Design a binder for this molecule. Sequence first.
Ligand SMILES: COc1cc(-c2cncc(-c3ccc(C4CCN(C)CC4)cc3)c2C)cc(OC)c1OC
Ligand SMILES: COc1cc(-c2cncc(-c3ccc(C4CCN(C)CC4)cc3)c2C)cc(OC)c1OC
Ligand SMILES: COc1cc(-c2cncc(-c3ccc(C4CCN(C)CC4)cc3)c2C)cc(OC)c1OC
Length: 283
Amino acid sequence: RTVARDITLLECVGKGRYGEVWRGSWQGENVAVKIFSSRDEKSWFRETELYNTVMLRHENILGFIASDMTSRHSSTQLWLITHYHEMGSLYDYLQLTTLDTVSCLRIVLSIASGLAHLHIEIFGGKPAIAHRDLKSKNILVKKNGQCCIADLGLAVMHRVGTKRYMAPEVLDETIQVDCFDSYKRVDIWAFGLVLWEVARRMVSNGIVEDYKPPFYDVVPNDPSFEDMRKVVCVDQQRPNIPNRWFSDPTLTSLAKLMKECWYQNPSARLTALRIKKTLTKID
Ligand SMILES: COc1cc(-c2cncc(-c3ccc(C4CCN(C)CC4)cc3)c2C)cc(OC)c1OC
Ligand SMILES: COc1cc(-c2cncc(-c3ccc(C4CCN(C)CC4)cc3)c2C)cc(OC)c1OC
Ligand SMILES: COc1cc(-c2cncc(-c3ccc(C4CCN(C)CC4)cc3)c2C)cc(OC)c1OC
């Protein structure tokens, strides 16, 4: 039998320290092809090892297709091939798009659904998984209005995370590194920041905030580890909740939820399953 492995790389949709992502075509169908830099080779190995352990299949997890290693003259070429989401990342989407109540809730409940699926151990199943780099650039928007979580290059089963999204216990090096629940709680902190990024873009009473990344008003454009530690750990700052949210029942409920993701004490933070339950009882 013929094994068609040719992928036509059509356009670069992402370039960074990690390498590149391309829209490609296989057998008439869009795929996304991540080509790894030498800097980020260990992310290909980690994600490949995870999918070799458990073939994750969930509507709110970016769909795996293949891991490819190809011998070249004096290098190894590493590709991760996934489903393609033409709307691009949540970060991208929120820059020009505003949201209504329905769209805002659909986005954040879909993210909580993906994250709870990663976190939960299933017997008979899947190991529990912590993401370790959850942020709006690692979430894709689907045409049906739900999102999916991407990039399991730093994931742990039972490179550092993006500094702007690091929890206080990562910044102050108190994280209990021999407790898997510690890594779930770091993801919940980051989830609360993503929830703040999305809620800002939800219109109420003709008002919306501009897209900004978390802590935009208190750290530099490219913040250092120390910059983040001083804000989050020493001064114990949290993202601003605008007054206009307290006129809107949805944004009032979302402000309470994000506060419960941002406790200094990691064991006080909500679980992903509790976040799901709370979201299903809003609006
Ligand atoms: C090697 O590499 C790539 C392969 C493919 C691909 C292309 N056609 C057919 C296949 C296929 C799948 C499954 C079987 C089964 C049949 C039943 N039996 C119980 C075991 C074997 C056979 C063949 C594949 C996997 C695509 C690729 O890219 C999209 C590949 O490159 C990453
Ligand atoms: C990697 O990705 C894609 C792969 C394929 C693809 C191509 N040839 C054959 C297969 C296949 C056939 C049969 C079995 C099973 C059936 C039951 N039992 C007997 C065990 C063996 C498995 C696999 C597939 C799945 C198509 C895709 O898209 C349409 C893929 O997605 C891009
Ligand atoms: C976060 O990480 C990964 C993401 C992806 C991925 C999957 N579907 C679609 C995309 C994409 C497509 C198109 C645009 C643009 C095109 C220009 N227009 C003006 C706005 C939209 C952006 C993004 C990506 C980047 C795949 C990955 O692996 C193969 C990723 O890494 C795990």
